[PDB]
Ligand binder design. Structure first.
Ligand code: HEM
Ligand code: NA
Ligand code: NA
Length: 1254
C-alpha cells in the first residue's frame, strides 16, 4: 500500500483529488502544521506553499524528512525559503504538469504515477499518460445542452459566432467583461444575460489587455487576486469606464456570518488592499461554499447576495444615459444641536454648499427655489434643517408646527422594513426603543417627522444621532448598540420614498460607517450594508485624514473625492520676543570669565514673560542660569518664530488669495532644501557642530539662504537647470550622474545610499517649485469638474494621501485615495527611524530622573500615523523589548529574532499597548507579532543586564492572585499586553462623561469607567475580543512613561479632541493605579527629514503662544463666517478636558491670558462684535466652560473675574436666545452657580429663558 500526506491544502482542491482516486492501494491522509513530526511514516509528502506561514522549528522538521529519504514536493511557494524539494528534474516537471493544469483526468494519472515511479513497487497499476495541457489565454462559456461541459475559444471572432448560433447575442446591448479565477461565476454570468447584456468571460493571467482592446466593453468585473498594473489605469482614464471587484469567502455561509473579523492577513491584502491602487470600487461579498451529499465543498454565489449585486450594476450604468433633468440626488451634512453651525474638517460648509448647487443648475439639473445668496441659504437651513437633543422637549415640539417636516405613517415604515431588514435584527431596535414611532419628534396622530429641505430634484438632510442618550457611561459586555427609529427611517425614506439615484456625504466625517458589527466583508446582518442598499455612493473627504477614509470605502462602499486644506502662513511673533533675543546674543558674545551679570539679565526677561513655566525652570532671586539652561531658552524662542499656522478656512470653487498662494509655496519647499543640504555637509565633514546645537545658527546658515533660492524660482521657473543643482549642493557634475543611477535601481555601501537620497531630495524639490504654484490655482476648478463627471458614471483616478507639506504628490485634488500594504511593515526605512526615536526617549528620561531608566513604557497606536510613516511606532515598541524583524526575499515580515543582551547594552524594558478601532481594521496581524515578541523576551535567560520583562510578569501574577483568581488563570492572563475598546467599539466613550460636569465628583470615578470601557483583549486570534476583570489593571503596574504619536500639520494638542481622550485617559488611569503621575512625550512625525521627541507641557506652551494669544492668528480667522468662529469654542473645551486629566499641565496664568483677550478685549481687535454677527452660540459656549472650571476648583479665579463672566453670559442669552448644548441647557448645578453671581433682576429673567426649551 502507498501512503500520501497532504499539508496545508485547500478544501475544494483536496476533495477533488480524493474523488478522482480509483486505486485500492493508494491511501490519502492530511497532516496539520503542528504534527510535522509524523512525516517519517509516509511514502510521499505534498506541501502547499501558497501563503504558508511557519517558523524555523516547523521548517526544520520538514527539512529533516527530506534528508531522511522521504520524497517531498512543494507547490507554488511564495517565500523562497519554504521551497523544499528532493526530486529529479524529470519528476518535478511531470508532477507540476498534472497539478498545474488540473482536471480529474490529470489527477488520477498523477496518483498512478506516484505508485509506479516514485514508490517503486509497481505491482498492479494501469498505464499512465502524459499530462493534458490547457490553453492559458481564452474565452470560456458553459455548454448550452450540458452545463457541466465547458466550451473554450481562442479568438473573439470564434466566441461571437458561438453566441449567434445559440441566440445569446442582442443587437445594441451594452457589453460587460468578466476576469479572474478565484471562484465559479456560472450563476453571475447567467444572471447578467437575463438583465439584457452581452457578457465576455475571459481567463488570461498575463495578456488580458489584448482581449479588452478588441471588445471595448462598458464595464469590467474582476475577481481580483493581486494588482492589474499601470497599463489598466491608463486604459480606464482614456475610456472613462468603471471597474468592480467582488469578494470570495472560503468557508460555509453559517461560519462566515458568525465571524467578527471576516478577513485578515495576506488574503485580505490580495483581495482588498491591492486592487484599490487600480481604482476598484464596491468590495461586495458574493461567493461562498456549500457541502454536497458525499461531503465535498463546492463554490457558488449566494442567491440573496446575487440579486443586490446585479441591481447595483444597473444603477451605475444608467447614470450615463439618463438625462440630467430627471436625476434625483440626496445630500447629507452634519450640524450641531440647537443653533450651532455646520462643521467639516477645514471647510466653510454653507458657502461651499451654495457653490455646488449653482454648478449643478448650469449642468441642467432640475433645481428650483434656490435663494439669492449664501446668507439666505444659511437662514433656511436653521429654520427647516435643525436637530435637537432628547431633553429639549419644548424645542422640537415647536419645530413640528413651524418647520414643515416629512411625515411617515406606520404602513409605509413596516413595508420598508420587511423589504430591507431581517426580522431578528429589527427585533433589537424594539427591545431598546419600543414600537414605532418612539418618543422623538412624534405627531399626536402617530407619525414620525423627518427634517429636510428640497429644491426640485435635490434634497438636503441632516444626520441624526446613531445612539441613545441614556446617560449610562459604562458599556455592558455582550450587547451591541442599535440605531433609533429616526436614524433608520431617514435612510429608508431615501431608498424607497424619495427614490434617489445617487447619494453624497458632504465633509469629514459622518457616523454611518462606524455602526456594528463586522470589520470587513459585511453580511446582511450589518447596518452599514443594509442602510446604503444598491444606490451609488459618493463621499467628499479631506487629504489630511487618509487613515479614517478607509473605513468609508470598505464598510459603506463609498467613492472618495478629495479636497484641499486651509492655506499656511508664518506666525509673525518674532517682533514680540525681539528684546529677549538681544540679551541672549550679548551673553553668547561675552568673553569675560564671570558671565553672571549677563546671565541674570536673561533670567529677568524669561521670568517676566512666563517662559520659565513652560520649560520647567526655577524663578530664584539671585541664582543665575547655567550654560545649558540658557541654550534651552534660545531654542524655545527660535521655535516660536519659525512656526507655521493655518489661516482662513477653505471654500469650494474659490482659490486662495494671491498673498496666501505665495506663502503656501514657501512652506512646501523651504524645509526640504534646508535639511537636505545640512545632511550633505555633515557627511563631508564640515563645521556643522555649532548649527546642530543652536537653532539661531541653523536659521542663518541653512534656512535663510534656502528662502532666497525659492523666491527666484517662483518668478522664473526656467532656471531649474542641472547647473543650479550641482552648484547649490556643491557637487561636481559627474557625482550628480551616479546619484540618479542608485535611485533607478531601487525604483553599494551604506554611506553611498545615504548620499544619494539627500541629493534626490534637493533635485526633486527644485524642479517642481513652478508646478506647486500652478497646482494650487487650478485645484478648485478640478474638484467641481471631477464630481460632475462622477455623477455621469465616469472614472475617478487614484491618489495617495497626506497634507501637501508632508506629501506633495497629493496635488491636484479630486481623486480617490488608497493605502499601503500592512504585511510589509515595519519597512526598512521605518526600522531605522524607530530605533533613533527609542534612544531619545531613554536619554530624556535619564536627564530628569538622575540617570535612571524606566521600568515600563505605554504606547497608543493610530491609523493615520501608521500609513504615512510605514509603521515607525511599531519599531519603537519592538526595540524596547529587544526583538528585531526577519524579512524574506520579497520584503515581507513574518518572523522575529532576539537581540543579544551584550549588543543591546541596557536592560530590557516592558511595554503595554492600547489601540483604536480604525487601526485594528488596517493591521490586525501586526498586533499578533507584538504579543508574540513579549513572550519571547520574558523567557530570555542568562542576560548580562537585568531582564525587566520577566519581573513584570511575576508582579502581574501576584496582583491577580490577590484579587481572587485561580492559579491556572492567573498564569495565563499575566501576559496580556494589547488592549482596546469593549464590544469592538471604535472609541473610548469618555468624552461624554467628562463634559457632563454635574454627574461626577472625583477623578477616581472616571478612572473606573476608563478601565471598564478599554479592557478588551486583542492579542491573539483565538482569544479575539475577550474581557477579563482586572486584566487591564494588572498590566499597568510600574508604568513610567506615556507616548503619543503625531504626524499632521493641521492639528495640535489643543485643537483635536481625540488627543486628550486617549493620551489623557491613559495618564489618569496610571496615576490611580500606581499612585504616581508619569511622564508624557510626543512623537513628532511632521518633518519627514527631522524627527524628534517633545515634552507635553512644552508643546502646550508653543501652541497657545502662536494661535489663540497671537494677534495675527485672530485677525486671519475674523475674515471667515460661522464655521471659523466655531473653532474658538472647540479649543476652549479641550483646555477644560486637559485640566481634568492632567492638572499639572495647565497653569493658572493660561486661564488669565484667555480672560484678558476674549472678555476684556486687551488687543483692541473687536472680538465681541465679530461673534454677535457670525455665531453668537459659540460665545455662549466659551463663557460657560470657563465658569465650570471655577466651580469645580480647577481654576482659582477671583470674584471680579467671576462677576464679569456671569454678566457677559446672561446678556448674550437674553438677546440671542439659548443654543442648548450640553453645557448651557443640561447642567443644573452650573445654572444655579451663574444665577447667584448676577443681579437679582437679571437672575429671574435668565432662569425663565432656560425653562422655555426644557
Ligand atoms: C489557482 C491559483 C491561486 C490560488 C487558488 C491562490 C490562492 C491564494 C490564497 C488562498 C492565499 C492566502 C493563503 C492563506 O491565507 O492561507 C494566497 C496568497 C497569495 N497569493 Fe495566491 N493564489 C493563486 C495564484 C497566485 C499567483 C499566480 C500568484 C502570483 C504572484 C499569487 C500570489 C499570491 C500572494 C503574493 C499571496 C500573499 C501571500 C502572503 O502574503 O503571505 N497567487 N493565494
Ligand atoms: Na473623529
Ligand atoms: Na467633545
Amino acid at each position: 500500500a502507498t501512503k500520501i500526506a497532504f499539508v496545508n491544502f485547500q478544501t475544494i482542491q483536496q476533495g477533488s483529488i480524493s474523488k478522482a482516486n480509483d486505486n485500492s492501494f493508494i491511501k490519502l491522509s492530511e497532516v496539520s502544521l503542528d504534527n510535522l513530526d509524523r512525516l517519517t511514516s509516509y511514502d510521499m509528502v505534498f506541501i502547499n506553499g501558497m501563503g504558508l506561514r511557519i517558523v524555523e522549528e516547523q521548517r526544520q522538521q520538514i527539512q529533516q524528512a527530506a534528508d531522511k529519504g522521504i520524497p517531498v514536493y512543494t507547490s507554488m511557494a511564495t517565500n523562497p525559503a519554504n521551497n523544499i524539494c528532493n526530486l529529479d528534474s524529470i519528476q518535478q516537471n511531470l508532477i507540476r504538469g498534472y497539478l498545474s493544469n488540473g482536471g480529474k483526468t490529470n489527477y488520477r494519472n498523477m496518483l498512478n504515477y506516484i505508485r509506479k515511479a516514485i514508490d517503486g513497487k509497481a505491482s498492479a497499476v494501469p498505464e499512465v499518460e502524459d499530462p493534458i495541457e490547457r490553453p492559458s489565454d481564452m474565452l470560456y462559456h458553459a455548454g448550452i445542452s450540458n452545463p457541466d461541459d465547458e466550451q473554450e475559444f481562442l479568438t473573439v471572432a470564434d466566441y461571437e459566432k458561438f453566441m449567434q448560433e445559440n441566440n445569446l447575442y442582442k443587437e445594441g446591448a451594452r457589453k460587460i467583461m468578466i476576469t479572474g479565477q478565484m471562484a465559479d461565476a456560472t450563476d453571475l454570468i447567467k444572471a447578467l444575460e437575463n438583465a439584457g447584456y452581452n457578457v465576455y468571460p475571459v481567463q488570461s493571467m498575463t495578456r488580458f489587455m489584448s482581449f479588452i482592446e478588441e471588445v471595448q466593453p462598458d464595464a469590467v468585473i474582476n475577481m481580483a487576486h493581486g494588482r492589474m498594473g499601470d497599463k489598466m489605469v491608463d486604459y480606464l482614464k482614456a475610456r472613462n469606464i468603471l471597474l468592480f471587484a467582488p469578494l470570495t469567502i472560503n468557508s460555509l455561509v453559517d461560519e462566515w456570518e458568525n465571524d467578527p473579523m471576516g478577513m485578515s492577513g495576506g488574503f485580505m491584502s490580495q483581495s482588498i488592499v491591492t486592487p484599490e491602487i487600480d481604482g476598484a470600487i464596491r468590495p461586495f461579498a458574493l461567493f461562498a461554499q456549500y457541502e454536497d451529499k458525499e461531503g465535498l465543498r463546492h463554490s457558488y454565489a449566494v442567491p440573496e447576495r446575487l440579486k443586490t449585486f446585479v441591481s447595483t450594476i444597473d444603477n451605475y450604468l444608467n447614470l450615463k444615459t439618463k438625462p440630467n433633468f430627471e436625476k434625483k440626488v440626496a445630500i447629507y451634512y452634519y450640524k450641531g444641536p440647537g443653533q450651532n453651525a455646520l462643521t467639516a474638517a477645514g471647510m466653510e460648509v454653507v458657502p461651499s454648499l451654495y457653490n455646488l448647487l449653482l454648478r449643478m443648475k448650469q449642468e441642467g439639473y432640475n433645481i428650483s427655489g434656490l435663494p439669492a445668496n449664501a446668507q439666505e441659504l444659511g437662514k433656511m437651513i436653521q429654520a427647516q434643517g435643525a436637530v435637537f437633543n432628547a431633553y429639549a422637549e419644548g424645542a422640537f415640539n415647536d419645530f413640528m408646527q413651524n418647520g414643515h417636516p416629512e411625515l411617515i405613517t406606520k404602513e409605509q415604515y413596516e413595508s420598508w422594513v420587511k423589504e430591507s431588514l431581517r426580522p431578528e435584527k429589527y427585533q433589537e431596535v424594539v427591545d431598546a426603543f419600543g414600537e414605532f414611532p418612539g418618543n422623538y419628534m412624534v405627531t399626536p396622530d402617530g407619525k414620525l417627522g423627518i427634517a429636510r429641505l428640497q429644491f426640485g430634484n435635490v434634497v438636503l438632510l441632516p444626520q441624526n444621532a446613531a445612539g441613545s442618550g441614556d446617560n449610562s457611561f459604562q458599556v455592558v459586555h455582550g450587547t451591541d448598540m442599535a440605531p433609533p427609529h429616526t436614524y433608520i427611517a431617514s435612510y429608508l425614506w431615501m431608498q424607497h420614498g424619495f427614490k434617489a439615484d445617487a447619494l453624497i456625504h458632504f465633509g469629514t466625517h459622518g457616523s454611518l460607517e462606524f455602526t456594528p458589527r463586522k470589520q470587513v466583508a459585511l453580511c446582511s446582518n450589518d447596518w452599514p450594508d443594509r442602510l446604503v442598499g444598491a444606490v451609488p455612493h459618493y463621499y467628499l473627504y479631506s487629504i489630511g485624514n487618509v487613515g479614517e477614509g478607509m473605513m468609508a470605502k470598505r464598510r459603506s462602499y463609498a467613492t472618495l473625492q478629495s479636497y484641499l486644506t486651509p492655506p499656511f502662513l508664518e506666525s509673525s511673533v518674532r517682533g514680540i520676543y525681539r528684546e529677549l533675543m538681544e540679551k541672549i546674543k550679548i551673553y553668547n558674545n561675552s568673553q569675560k570669565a564671570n558671565k553672571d551679570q549677563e546671565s541674570l539679565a536673561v533670567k529677568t526677561l524669561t521670568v517676566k514673560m512666563g517662559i520659565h513655566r513652560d520649560l520647567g525652570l526655577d524663578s530664584m532671586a539671585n541664582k543665575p542660569y547655567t550654560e545649558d539652561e540658557i541654550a534651552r531658552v534660545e531654542n524655545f524662542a527660535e521655535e516660536l518664530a519659525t512656526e507655521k499656522i493655518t489661516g482662513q478656512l477653505y471654500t469650494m470653487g474659490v482659490p486662495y488669495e494671491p498673498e496666501r498662494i505665495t506663502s503656501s509655496v514657501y512652506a512646501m519647499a523651504t524645509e526640504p532644501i534646508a535639511y537636505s543640504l545640512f545632511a550633505l555637509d555633515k557627511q563631508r565633514g564640515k563645521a556643522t557642530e555649532s548649527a546642530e546645537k543652536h537653532r539661531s545658527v541653523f536659521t542663518q546658515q541653512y534656512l535663510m539662504p534656502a528662502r532666497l533660492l525659492v523666491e527666484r524660482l517662483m518668478a522664473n521657473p526656467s532656471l531649474a537647470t542641472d547647473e543650479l543643482i550641482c552648484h547649490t549642493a556643491g557637487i561636481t557634475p559627474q557625482e550628480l550622474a551616479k546619484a540618479r543611477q542608485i535611485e533607478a535601481e531601487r525604483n553599494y555601501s551604506k554611506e553611498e545610499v545615504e548620499f544619494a537620497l539627500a541629493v534626490a531630495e534637493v533635485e526633486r524639490t527644485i524642479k517642481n517649485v513652478g508646478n506647486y504654484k500652478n497646482a494650487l490655482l487650478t485645484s478648485p476648478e478640478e474638484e467641481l469638474s471631477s464630481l460632475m463627471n462622477a455623477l455621469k458614471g465616469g472614472y475617478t483616478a487614484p491618489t495617495p494621501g497626506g497634507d501637501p507639506i508632508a506629501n506633495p504628490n497629493t496635488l491636484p485634488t479630486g481623486r480617490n485615495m488608497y493605502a499601503i500594504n500592512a504585511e510589509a511593515t515595519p519597512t526598512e526605512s521605518a526600522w531605522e527611524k524607530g530605533i533613533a526615536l527609542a534612544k531619545q526617549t531613554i536619554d530624556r528620561y535619564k536627564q530628569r530622573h538622575n540617570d535612571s531608566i524606566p521600568r515600563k513604557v505605554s504606547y497608543t497606536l493610530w491609523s493615520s500615523e501608521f500609513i504615512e510613516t510605514g509603521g515607525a511606532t511599531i519599531a519603537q515598541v519592538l526595540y524596547m523589548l529587544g526583538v528585531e524583524p526577519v524579512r524574506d526575499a520579497f520584503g515581507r515580515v513574518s518572523d522575529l529574532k532576539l537581540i543579544p543582551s551584550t549588543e543591546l547594552g541596557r536592560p530590557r524594558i516592558d511595554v503595554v499597548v492600547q489601540t483604536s478601532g480604525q487601526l485594528r481594521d488596517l493591521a490586525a496581524s501586526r498586533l499578533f507579532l507584538i504579543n508574540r515578541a513579549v513572550e519571547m523576551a520574558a523567557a530570555a535567560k542568562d542576560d548580562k543586564y537585568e531582564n525587566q520583562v520577566a519581573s513584570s510578569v511575576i508582579e502581574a501574577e501576584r496582583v491577580l492572585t490577590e484579587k481572587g483568581l485561580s492559579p491556572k488563570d492567573a498564569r495565563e492572563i499575566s501576559t496580556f499586553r494589547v488592549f482596546g475598546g469593549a464590544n469592538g467599539m471604535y472609541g473610548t466613550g469618555i468624552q461624554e462623561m467628562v463634559e457632563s460636569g454635574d454627574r461626577w465628583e472625583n477623578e477616581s470615578e472616571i478612572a473606573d469607567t476608563y478601565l471598564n470601557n478599554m479592557g478588551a483583549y486583542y492579542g491573539s486570534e483565538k482569544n479575539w475580543e475577550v474581557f477579563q476583570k482586572f486584566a487591564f489593571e494588572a498590566a499597568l503596574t510600574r508604568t513610567d512613561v506615556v507616548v503619543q504619536p503625531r504626524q499632521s500639520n493641521t492639528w495640535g494638542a489643543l485643537s483635536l479632541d481625540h488627543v486628550y481622550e486617549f493620551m489623557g485617559g491613559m495618564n489618569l488611569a496610571v496615576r490611580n493605579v500606581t499612585g504616581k503621575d508619569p511622564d508624557a512625550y510626543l512623537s513628532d512625525y511632521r518633518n519627514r527629514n527631522h524627527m524628534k521627541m517633545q515634552e507635553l507641557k512644552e508643546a502646550v506652551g508653543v501652541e497657545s503662544r502662536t494661535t489663540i494669544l497671537n494677534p495675527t492668528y485672530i485677525k486671519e480667522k475674523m475674515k471667515g463666517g460661522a464655521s471659523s468662529a466655531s473653532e474658538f469654542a472647540e479649543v476652549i473645551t479641550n483646555t477644560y478636558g486637559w485640566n481634568v486629566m492632567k492638572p499639572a499641565a495647565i497653569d493658572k496664568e493660561l486661564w488669565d491670558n484667555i480672560y484678558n483677550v476674549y472678555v476684556k478685549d486687551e488687543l483692541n481687535l473687536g472680538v465681541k462684535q465679530y461673534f454677535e454677527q457670525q455665531n453668537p452660540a459659540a460665545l455662549e459656549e466659551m463663557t460657560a466652560v470657563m465658569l465650570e472650571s471655577a466651580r469645580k476648583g480647577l481654576w482659582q479665579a477671583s470674584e471680579e473675574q467671576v462677576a464679569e463672566l456671569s454678566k457677559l453670559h446672561t446678556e448674550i442669552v437674553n438677546t440671542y436666545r439659548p443654543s442648548c448644548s450640553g453645557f448651557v441647557c443640561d447642567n443644573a448645578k452650573l445654572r444655579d452657580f451663574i444665577a447667584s453671581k448676577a443681579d437679582a433682576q437679571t437672575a429671574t429673567q435668565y432662569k425663565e429663558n432656560i425653562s422655555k426649551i426644557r
